[PDB]
């Protein structure tokens, strides 16, 4: 039951943006508009902006979930590699098995789908700060794209869904991600083609 990656702006005109780096330090991440792909370093904070034409209702939620981009790997759950999963770096908030974490949000839910077993993280939707037209969410990717036993060099797509309090779909957008040692080098290389 591979999750959908169909872009859907929906009633609120939901879409992502990667124009503002916020507190992310230079060299830790870079986004390629041409490839709609974010390149980031292991465990470094990466800001992603949410935009809506109209503010959604109370109880609206934002979910982030990763899936493999390639057809032959889509049915496989994206998870932490064996090596990083057994590492002791977290107390008990974000499960060691989850690739994606949200940073700086006291209301993050780390979920494991009871049927598909897929991992995702959800936070309540919050409107932009006064004076801004976007909402920033900081993510952290806990494995390198090259991690053996994990992503194992396979490209992934991060799907962001806007949902109501019951889980109904309100909007969807996505972007490819590569977790690597030098985001800029890989972005330049991939843009060559
Ligand atoms: Zn790993």
Domains of the chain, earliest start first: 1-193 (2.60.40.720)
Resolution (A): 1.2
Ligand 1 centroid to Cα of residue 96, in Å, is 10
Beta-strand runs (E) in 41-188:
46-51, 61-68, 100-103, 109-112, 119-124, 135-141, 156-163, 169-179
The helix/strand/coil state of 66 is strand
Joined tokens for residue 91 = 């107390």
The helix/strand/coil state of 124 is strand
Q: Is 147 annotated among the ligand-binding residues? A: yes
Give the C-alpha distances (Å, rounded to integers) separating 171 from 16, 52, 94, 137, 193: 11, 10, 25, 16, 31
- The three-point CA angle 4-9-10 to 5° equals 95
If you search the block for the tokens 């036993």, which residue do you land on? 149
Question: 121-130 in b/e burial notation, b at 16+ Cβ within 10 A?
Answer: bbbebeeeee
Q: How was this structure determined?
A: X-ray
Residues with CB under 5 A from ligand 1 (ion): 81, 84, 143, 147, 150
User: Can you tell me the distance from the alpha carbon of 50 to that of 135, in angstroms, rounded to the nearest whole number?
Assistant: 5
Joined tokens for residue 120 = 């995702």
Q: Is 143 annotated among the ligand-binding residues? A: yes
Q: Is 180 annotated among the ligand-binding residues? A: no
Ligand 1 centroid to Cα of residue 57, in Å, is 37
Q: Is 81 annotated among the ligand-binding residues? A: yes
User: Can you tell me the distance from the alpha carbon of 109 to that of 12, in angstroms, rounded to the nearest whole number?
Assistant: 23
């Amino acid at each position: 039951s591979v999750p959908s990656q169909k872009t859907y702006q929906g009633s609120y005109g939901f879409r992502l943006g990667f124009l503002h780096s916020g507190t992310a330090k230079f060299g830790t991440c870079t986004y390629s508009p041409a490839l709609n792909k974010m390149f980031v370093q292991l465990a470094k904070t990466v800001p992603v902006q949410l935009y809506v034409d109209s503010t959604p209702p109370p109880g609206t939620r934002v979910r982030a979930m990763a899936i493999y981009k390639q057809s032959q790997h889509m049915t496989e759950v994206v998870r932490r590699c064996p090596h990083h999963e057994r590492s002791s770096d977290s107390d008990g908030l974000a499960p060691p098995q989850h690739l994606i974490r949200v940073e700086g949000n006291l209301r993050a839910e780390y979920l494991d789908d009871p049927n598909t077993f897929r991992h995702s993280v959800v936070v309540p939707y919050e409107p932009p700060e006064v004076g801004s037209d976007y909402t920033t969410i900081y993510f952290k990717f806990m494995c390198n794209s090259s991690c053996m036993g994990g992503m194992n060099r396979r490209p992934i797509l991060v799907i962001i869904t806007l949902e109501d309090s019951s889980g109904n779909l309100l909007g969807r957008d996505s972007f490819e991600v590569r977790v690597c040692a030098c985001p800029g080098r890989d972005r330049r290389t991939e843009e060559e083609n």
